[PDB]
Symmetry: D2
Subunit: 357 residues, 4 copies
């Protein structure tokens, strides 16, 4: 297990941006700008910097051209400039590789620390960022599918309890999780900013980035994204949804960018800011835990996720999960799920719900 | 081929109500009233008469207790009392069995003609009906899932072209249809009231009733029905959806009542009332034709449908479709669908879209 | 009273388009295209042809440059080419001036009849029109405020019963109206296509055009139009709303184009297509009849409306209403309105609701 | 008001209000039958109500009494120890305090009430009885469902004096309304990372302007209006619905049976970063309150609820001497603009959209 440092944890505000390596910058621009409507904060021949409708920091997404599509950094904003120093001491005590750039790794971020964290993920911590025009009332720019905030990340990692404890020490609080009666944990959601999560852990082979999630105002905004993808005849890039989540209670959609990076669109989870916020544990065999309406979870959702890079820009080696697989125990040949616990009517054995194998 | 009568067709206004035979009147009441929120016009120990939020005629749905769950009548309102005379002469010329009752078959309907039509379906034609309180501004009653109108019926019949010609002679105009490149028709939608349909034909073994559809005002009302069914832990009665249709462009959901009668919830199709309204023909292998977002159509949607009765109340014998099956050609072991015509990428061979078999 | 002709009425399908004369074509284009998002079917230096998201006929709105802003024609589509002949015979029997153009008055319309109707309004009847790409599934184009259909017209005329009878003979059925207990009709709504209206009559000096109405899919689309107008710092062009109507039960908004032509945005009225559809009569003093939430009706809504042209292109002379004024009897100095019939509590005497008086 | 040496309590959020109501049954009809709030406890004396997503015992306590008024506006603090900190903080300010180890109302434990420097009855507590969180109970969900308590708004005569005091208590200003000659008319300030938890409106005070509840979506607010029309109580819709300038939220103001003002609110923005950009509006900007330029009804500026001291007696009102927002915008000498510097779309001596004061 990952020891708790004696050094104080940095005070993390929220998830702030991701840097994604993409192979074809123009095709990625098409997707994030022309399809999804994100707002350009800066661009050149090598990178595109993008933000959501309500953001005032420089960006929520950096697309960087490179040879291998991968997550390069998932960045958290910290409360004060001194929290970057705290982050550096903390990860140094953990024995992690760190790199400090006083003028930042990407445009519009100042003093920043990147680390290869104990789960193999490239985290950035920063305070300083260039403020830009907050577009929250620019209804002359507002899209029918407008993405309004960056909401969270979701990470694939083999040992969820191990990661959970490490994130708890860093000040994240678990809001919801998925377990079975045998005591296996399959997934956990944890927050700093007072929503259901800022990052989440999904059990599986890792380190891999499962998705980045953006918010909309209303459910019809998410519908419109689907409708637009149909009109553009790219409905094959709709992976899963739209649906209502069990965990989080949010309305959701998962789509795939040109490099198969998964993006979640999300709205209307609940407030978690009180320190005794009640934690919700779902049973892995509950067929309403993921999609509340009982729609089946496509296998690619469980098996596919993005590579992540180390600080040299090389792909991180993957460690295979040895705990039980959520896919296998729910929709695989020996799996099952229920609608009502203890009722064989509305239960599914060795296949998924709604009549699919 | 069904001949065109010399006798003038009745002027049909719209689909008006269905009479469904149900086996447990209390369990059906719980579904239609407590779950779905339909409004009771009249009830006793044998029947429940239900209407939608904006209706002023007596009812849109009659639940009749009986031994075998089935459609007993699908009723269309005609423009004048004299149109019921026209209907009787028309169907008599077609050689169809008819029955006229000057004081109605069900409460709140006056002079009414029931027929066993050329496709084996029990049609009713009526003008006279008891007006009731139109609840369209009763927002003190309005449900988060409120059903606002009856929109259409959908019939399973083995020979779609044969049925289409008959309905056209009767004054219905085809709005959309599904065909392939080998001369087969799989489905057609046709209207009187200036929406995408009043009734529709689905290719399959029949006569059977595929579904009855009710409208909501907005898409979030359909999402609420799903959310409520999750909370009631009856998500296993959500068959398909929610989604955006290709055909009709409506937002939709299909659910199953306690006798497996299929109900569609529907909103926001388009105006068809101009006589040169452009017809839209989809290819049966186009994976956006049914669900615009490419979500797979569950096999039960193709295979399951309700019995229909003759005028003596006996189940109509089912005649097998010999034309190609939409299920088989799209999602069966030798099926095919595409996202983009001519593009191998995003096509599906011998399985359904989005990872499922 | 206007006689019922012996000649059969044309079979009218629906309101189809309006031709509005505008003074500055580029400013008008900015409003209808850049602000409101209507789709351009054709344009040149003299005219802009616009359609809604779900339309397949050539256009729903023609903007024509000219010296005096006005309604030039309100056009109804008829069921068959033969109905254009029927319309011509019908209006000739009424003694009205008519003009027939075999190849249309505006682009994308074929054989068309324009008439100076008995209320002084320029009506067009046509069947033939150039079909265009129906954009109803073009969600790549869909705006957060998208206008999806043309819904109706609303006309200001001094004598509502006179107009009502004439339109009923033409086959429109009244769906709702506003009357008082002393025999006065203040407004009526009437349809062909099975919505609350295709045209409507509002009591006042006329002929003038009160508004043209377009639909949206959902209420949030109307909210977005307001939000966008705020962002563009043209909220002064929001005249009234948004609200819920009593009459029609639709969610609504009224805005003003650059020549002060009034546009209604509208959604979620109810089905009226049955021939015995119940007619709803509201009392003029009911403060929920126009805005269901009781918000006050701005005086300009009652006083301001667009000029209309005759067939020569000259403005029609205005005839003064002599019947009682809706403005005066509800929000004027001797006006009255109620929230609950017979309850003094929530009534308004000599002023508007919600703490306001006439400016 | 000086900054104490004693540390401020760590305040999480607004948590509940206790309103005194004169007829408990009529108030129940409004809050439960009209608005759909959920009952956590009730008897002949009190009704305890919560929103759809709440897990603490209540967001609103309706207490029967002779004079309708705010009795307490309560904030939840982060730890039990923060209640001790609140007590020492307000004692150093010289304010009257009362501590009850077992609470003032049911479902709250150790609690401190104070008559604060602006005359308002604040409560601070940590301990509360958890209840069933109804957030997925879509079998109960109303077309107008109130999902959270969002904020309070207080009327006080000197906004800068109040603002400085709340800043010392850890609230951060998000937005405000000023004029060019240095008068402040209103300020909004937060702890939980929304546009506010409490807010100050310039006017005679102390009075409680409103309590605000959230919905999920804008159509839920529309439904509340529609329902009030159907119930033929549209006269209790005071103002709206609208889009706010300040906050950018969709809104509605309605009046309960004792004229307590309730706001329904949705879709403001995230303010939790410590350098969150502040926004200051000019008082003459006709889009600052209603973004669409709809007129602000005069009662919104003039009417607000009494507040009580710790003995249950009404607090004396102190008159505002700074300029009045009503007078400078919609009064006979008032003005507002749509575009700064433009006479077109400006209003002089009356409100927008063709109305003057009734
Ligand atoms: O539907 C699921 O898989 C559960 C779930 C809940 C919240 C999320 O953000 C997420 O990505 C996944
Ligand atoms: O419209 C207004 O008056 C400005 C405003 C903004 C946010 C609030 O919560 C509020 O109560 C008032
Ligand atoms: Ca009278
Ligand atoms: Cl379908
Ligand atoms: Cl009106
Ligand atoms: Fe997620
Ligand atoms: Fe259907
Ligand atoms: Fe209108
Ligand atoms: Fe407020």
């Amino acid at each position: 297990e990952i020891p708790k440092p004696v050094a104080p944890a940095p005070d993390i505000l929220r998830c702030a941006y991701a840097e994604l390596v993409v192979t074809d910058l123009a095709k990625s621009r098409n997707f994030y700008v022309d399809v999804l409507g994100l707002h350009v904060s800066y661009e050149d021949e090598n990178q595109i910097y993008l933000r959501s409708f309500e953001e005032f920091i420089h960006h929520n997404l950096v697309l960087t051209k490179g040879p291998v599509a991968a997550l390069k950094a998932m960045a958290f904003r910290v409360r004060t400039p001194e929290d970057v120093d705290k982050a550096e001491a903390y990860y140094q005590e953990l024995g992690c590789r760190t790199e400090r750039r006083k003028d930042g790794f990407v445009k519009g971020i100042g003093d920043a620390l990147r680390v290869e964290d104990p789960l193999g993920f490239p985290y950035e911590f920063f305070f300083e960022t260039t403020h830009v025009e907050r577009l929250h009332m620019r209804y002359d720019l507002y899209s029918a599918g407008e993405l309004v905030r960056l909401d969270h990340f979701n990470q694939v990692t083999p040992d969820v309890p191990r990661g959970r404890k490490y994130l708890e020490d860093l000040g994240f609080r678990v809001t919801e999780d998925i377990q079975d009666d045998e005591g296996t944990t399959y997934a956990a959601w944890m927050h700093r900013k007072g929503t259901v999560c800022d990052t989440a852990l999904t059990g599986g082979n890792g380190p891999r980035l499962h998705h980045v999630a953006f918010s909309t105002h209303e459910k019809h905004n998410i519908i419109q994204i689907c409708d637009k993808m149909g009109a553009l005849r790219i409905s094959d890039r709709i992976e899963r949804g739209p649906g209502r989540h069990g965990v989080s209670n949010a309305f959701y959609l998962y789509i795939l960018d040109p490099d198969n990076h998964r993006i979640e669109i999300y709205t209307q989870d609940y407030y978690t800011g009180d320190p005794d916020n009640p934690t919700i544990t779902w049973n892995v065999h509950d067929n309403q835990r993921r999609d509340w309406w009982g729609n089946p979870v496509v296998p690619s959702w469980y098996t596919e996720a993005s590579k992540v890079l180390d600080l040299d820009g090389n792909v991180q080696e993957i460690i295979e999960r040895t705990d039980d697989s959520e896919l296998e125990v729910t929709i695989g040949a020996d799996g099952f799920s229920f609608t009502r616990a203890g009722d064989e009517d509305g239960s599914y054995h060795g296949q998924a719900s709604k009549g699919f194998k």
